[PDB]
Amino acid sequence: MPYWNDLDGDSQVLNDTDDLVPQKINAGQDKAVLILRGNAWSSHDLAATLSGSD
Amino acid sequence: AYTKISDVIVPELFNPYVINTTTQLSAFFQSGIAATDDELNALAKKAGGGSTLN
DSSP: OOBOOOOOOOOOOOOSSSOOOOOOOOOBOOOOOOOOOOOOOOOOSHHHHHHTOO | OOOOTTSSOOOOOOOOOOOOOOOSOOOOOSSSSOOOOHHHHHHSSSSSOOSOOO
């Protein structure tokens, strides 16, 4: 995702025998990450019926 | 002359489909062991499974 940084700078000495100069603007970047996970588990059977509960 | 069985095409026949009884024999019943009892009924069926009790 992008962004626009705000302006800054001096004013100037407003004066003759010379002219002004305009100025500019910049831009910028931003990132992120996707991640993903999972697991599992299991059992036997014979044990289940022999143990008295599930 | 004749229609002459030596001429007409004869089909065949299959009648499905039969199980074959199996030897040898097994009986030896009833005897020890026969005759279900109850204490074993406490034995086998869950819950509070085995192995076997006293």
